[PDB]
Amino acid sequence: PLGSMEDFVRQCFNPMIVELAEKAMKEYGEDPKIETNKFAAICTHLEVCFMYSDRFEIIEGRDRTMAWTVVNSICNTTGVEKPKFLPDLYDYKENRFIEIGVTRREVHTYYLEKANKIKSEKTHIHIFSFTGEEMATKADYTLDEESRARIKTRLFTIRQEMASRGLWDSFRQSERGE
Numbered sequence: 001p002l003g004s005m006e007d008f009v010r011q012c013f014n015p016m017i018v019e020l021a022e023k024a025m026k027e028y029g030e031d032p033k034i035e036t037n038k039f040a041a042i043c044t045h046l047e048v049c050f051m052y053s054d055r056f057e058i059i060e061g062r063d064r065t066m067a068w069t070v071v072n073s074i075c076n077t078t079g080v081e082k083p084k085f086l087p088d089l090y091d092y093k094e095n096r097f098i099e100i101g102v103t104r105r106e107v108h109t110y111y112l113e114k115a116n117k118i119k120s121e122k123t124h125i126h127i128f129s130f131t132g133e134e135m136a137t138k139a140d141y142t143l144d145e146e147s148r149a150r151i152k153t154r155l156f157t158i159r160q161e162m163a164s165r166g167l168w169d170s171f172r173q174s175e176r177g178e
């Protein structure tokens with residue numbers, strides 16, 4: 001009754017999500033078979049990105065060349081400052097890029113880590129946790145109540161399904177600062 005996180009990933013996430021996540025890992029010489037807790041964290045963040053977007057241009061998940069092409073194309077269609085890193089989404093409504101975080105640590109710690117990495121005055125940050133806690137730039141949450149509620153619900157489902165397999169203990173304890 002300690003299961004394999006790799007088998008859990010391929011069984012409980014959409015295959016398009018798993019493949020995008022495998023691609024993101026192999027891109028940086030990480031093996032999804034080895035760094036399995038990371039492989040689940042990456043799938044989860046991908047899934048949250050897709051849920052948040054249902055107005056929004058998806059950046060995360062794309063091949064890096066295509067992602068940057070898309071980011072530059074928006075920045076010169078609009079006024080927007082060009083991010084130093086490469087966000088997760090663009091919001092056509094509020095006309096800003098967004099970075100999404102999903103954390104198993106304290107949401108404040110993670111929010112400020114992200115703010116300090118990206119050093120942007122324009123990019124919106126929105127962090128979710130597996131506890132139902134969330135934090136978003138200027139207390140502007142962008143989406144409505146039941147839409148954020150659905151994301152928080154999917155996060156609970158992942159956590160309980162990991163718990164079922166004996167995987168949550170290690171998953172919850174193995175996030176480090178980026």
Ligand SMILES: Cc1cn([C@H]2C[C@H](O)[C@@H](COP(=O)(O)O)O2)c(=O)[nH]c1=O
Nearest residue numbers: 024041042043045046060061088100101
């Ligand atoms: C969802 C996803 C996550 N990740 C990793 C990097 C980060 O640690 C986290 C998501 O990246 P981000 O939160 O900086 O956008 O998971 C990828 O590398 N590629 C992906 O497609």
Ligand SMILES: [Mg+2]
Nearest residue numbers: 060086087088
């Ligand atoms: Mg990203």
